[PDB]
Write a protein that binds this DNA or RNA. Structure first.
Ligand code: STP
Ligand code: CA
Ligand code: MN
Length: 428
DNA sequence: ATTATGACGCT
DNA sequence: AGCGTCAT
């Protein structure tokens, strides 16, 4: 009882942009606003591959990883914006720069952890404490939470009507005398996230969703519950009902083989069902670390910190060469290594000026035709100068005798992927 | 021919 | 180090 940790020590949010690359293109081109539209990479093969989809277009069944020609079968009036191509490859700079706009605004409110190009975790624990005793124990008005859902409420017929009804039940039950009530802390966190999201939209034009809970996994889960342009508070008390029908694969890190093994080995389907195993039972099947993590996580408890990191730790350039485009000659491999290295140099040089740091290691990865995996081979060398010709020459030297062909001018087996990655940054 | 990334774990 | 997993 008195000694049972409940994982209610922190207030953590996750802010995730709505259909991010699409909003970037819609800001630039007003003709795309409020339309079914998608962002596509390349064009010659099946109209290009879709990587982002507006909510209007999702209503027609358009999804990521769909060919545009196929999306057009579902949505004939679908509008498209193409990813920039430079040096023969897709170039994501516009979206990385739009990401920085958003991350810099979020950083004004609290320290953030960049979790992807379009989302960040926020540790709001300290900000909440400050706002709380600036409030003098004043009640929190529904007006301060105009886009907030309280997961699990109302309990005991507009969609907005349901939202407000749930919010009212929550606020009516809130205890404001205690400055250490976890539920109150989450509520103040939600107030701050409304402010953050309003600042993002005002200053960039971009809308986003957010989750507010006591840890990163619940905040991420919460965020997705009421997308787009809304935020969701998942309280500790909401967890048993929420998890009672929550497929295991929906929890971050359980979407792959581990999650499948939990389902298989234990013969369960939902996150809540994990509570019926001992910590040692879970460790026996899934390992010491995973076992302890699952034991806590199915009770809504997780301790992974919000890391103070706003900038990516690596800067990489990659390109696939599928089917008959697979690289089969030396000069082909060399030319594409150079294209990659030139984009990498551009990004590295910018990074050095912006962020006062230098990469020290170059990682070279390839895939060969007929191979199992994402990467067939990974090798490193020293990154001593931001020079594309040197980096491409060094990458070639490193992947040199992967070529099994006796013919030296020819390359076999053909390469279906090249990847250059700058790593191991040092302050400068 | 589901591409371009990017973080972290294992040994 | 080099490979694997999982995520966006
Ligand atoms: N698998 C993959 N390949 C290439 N690019 C991706 C992929 N997944 C996501 N992205 C890009 C393009 C997205 O706009 C952006 C953010 O991804 P997410 O958050 S999964 O989806 P969004 O497009 O922002 O819609 P949503 O968050 O509102 O559901 O990253
Ligand atoms: Ca998003
Ligand atoms: Mn995202």
């Amino acid at each position: 009882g008195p000694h049972m940790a409940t994982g209610q020590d922190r207030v953590v949010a996750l802010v995730d942009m709505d259909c991010f690359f699409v909003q970037v293109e819609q800001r630039q081109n007003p003709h795309l606003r409020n339309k079914p539209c998608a962002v596509v990479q390349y064009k010659s093969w099946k109209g290009g591959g879709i990587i982002a989809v507006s909510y209007e277009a999702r209503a027609f069944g358009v999804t990521r990883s769909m060919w545009a020609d196929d999306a057009k079968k579902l949505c004939p009036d679908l509008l498209l914006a193409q990813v920039r191509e430079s040096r023969g490859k897709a170039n994501l700079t516009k979206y990385r720069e739009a990401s920085v706009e958003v991350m810099e605004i979020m950083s004004r409110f609290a320290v953030i952890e960049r979790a992807s190009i379009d989302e960040a975790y926020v540790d709001l624990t300290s900000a909440v404490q400050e706002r709380l005793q600036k409030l003098q124990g004043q009640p929190i008005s529904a007006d301060l939470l105009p886009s907030t859902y309280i997961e699990g409420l109302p309990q005991g017929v507009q969609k907005e009507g349901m939202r407000k009804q749930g919010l009212f039940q929550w606020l009516d039950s809130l205890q404001i005398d205690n400055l250490t009530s976890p539920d109150l802390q989450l509520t103040v966190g939600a107030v701050i996230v409304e402010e953050m999201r309003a600042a993002i939209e005002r200053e960039t034009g971009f809308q986003c969703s957010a989750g507010i809970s006591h840890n990163k996994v619940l905040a991420k889960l919460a965020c997705g519950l009421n997308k787009p342009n809304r935020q969701t508070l998942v309280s500790h008390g909401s967890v048993p009902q929420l998890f009672s029908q929550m497929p295991i694969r929906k929890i971050r890190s359980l979407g792959g083989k581990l999650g499948a093994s939990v389902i298989e080995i234990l013969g369960i389907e939902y996150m809540g069902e994990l509570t019926q195993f001992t910590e040692s039972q879970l460790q026996s099947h899934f390992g010491e670390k995973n076992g302890s993590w699952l034991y806590a996580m199915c009770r809504g408890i997780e301790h992974d910190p919000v890391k103070p990191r706003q900038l990516p730790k690596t800067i990489g350039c990659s390109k696939n060469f599928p089917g008959k485009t697979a690289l089969a000659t030396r000069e082909q491999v060399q030319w594409w290594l150079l294209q990659l290295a030139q984009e990498l140099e551009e990004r590295l040089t910018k990074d050095r000026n912006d962020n006062d740091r230098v990469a020290t290691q170059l990682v070279v990865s390839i895939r060969v035709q007929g191979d199992k995996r994402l990467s067939s081979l990974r090798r490193c060398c020293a990154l001593t100068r931001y020079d594309a010709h040197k980096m491409s020459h060094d990458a070639f030297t490193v992947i040199k005798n992967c070529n099994t062909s006796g013919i030296q001018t020819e390359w076999s087996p053909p390469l279906t992927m090249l990847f250059l990655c700058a790593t191991k940054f040092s302050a400068s």
